[PDB]
Write a protein that binds this ligand. Structure first.
Ligand SMILES: C[C@]12CCC(=O)C[C@@H]1CC[C@@H]1[C@@H]2CC[C@]2(C)[C@@H](O)CC[C@@H]12
Length: 245
């Protein structure tokens, strides 16, 4: 099972946010820690992506592009899995030192987005997603958002994305024909549901970056760069998700 061997081998370990839990749960402290966690997780997402089967087949400029458009969906999907496995999904397990309860959901002023993230987390339980399904679904999320004008070499991207869809298909077929088809429908519907959630968070973090000097929220360098250079291409419609349905 070469493909799943690789996905297990490269899956990132635990990342802490560095949050001071003795602080009061203020809007500023909570988002400053979420932003630091994003910066820390971005390092791991880059190293993970570059180690995926076939990823180096992409043009080098397309490699950075797909990471810089897919990161929010990748990290929210992984956080949903962490939450499902660690607290059976009624708190958001952003990190071992940054677990959101309903109070922090409210204080962060992103309660409705947290509710949608919690619903995504719960789907791992409702659908009884296996670790292998999770790993292959998360890899596919890296290949699920691109510029409407295409990448520098779109042909190799389309081929790579095709191959990851095939791997998802194999994972479903190894498990068990009408059940295979039902499962693939369920998993592709689940994958589609990540992008609307990521879009809402992209809108929220963009607005927060613009007003960050007035609400006392710190943005690390890579986050500030990606959210001002790449995220607005998503929000203005220059970069769009690839949906199954
Ligand atoms: C990706 C992160 C951080 C990593 C994670 O586990 C998911 C979580 C989802 C919300 C993001 C957060 C990074 C910082 C953001 C973008 C804040 O600015 C607003 C929403 C936060």
């Amino acid at each position: 099972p070469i493909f799943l061997n690789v996905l297990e081998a490269i899956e990132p370990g635990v990342v802490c946010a560095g949050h001071d839990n003795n602080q009061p749960d203020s809007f500023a402290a909570l988002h400053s820690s979420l932003n630091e966690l994003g910066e820390r997780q971005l390092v791991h997402v880059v190293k993970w992506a570059k180690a995926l089967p076939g990823f180096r087949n992409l043009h080098v400029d397309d490699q950075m592009a797909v990471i810089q458009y897919s990161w929010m969906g990748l990290m929210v999907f992984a956080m949903g899995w962490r939450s499902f496995t660690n607290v059976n999904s009624r708190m958001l397990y952003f990190a071992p030192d940054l677990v959101f309860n309903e109070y922090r959901m409210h204080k962060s002023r992103m309660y409705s987005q947290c509710v949608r993230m919690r619903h995504l987390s719960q789907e791992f339980g409702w659908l009884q997603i296996t670790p292998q399904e999770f790993l292959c679904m998360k890899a596919l999320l890296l290949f699920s958002i691109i510029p409407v004008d295409g990448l520098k070499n779109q042909k190799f991207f389309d081929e790579l994305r095709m191959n990851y869809i095939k791997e998802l298909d194999r994972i479903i077929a190894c498990k068990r024909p009408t059940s295979c088809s039902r499962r693939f429908y369920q998993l592709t519907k689940l994958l589609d549901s990540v992008q609307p959630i990521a879009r809402e968070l992209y809108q929220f973090t963009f607005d927060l970056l613009i007003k960050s000097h007035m609400v006392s929220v710190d943005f690390p360098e890579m986050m500030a760069e990606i959210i001002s250079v790449q995220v607005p291409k998503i929000l203005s419609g220059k970069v769009k998700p690839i949906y199954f349905h």
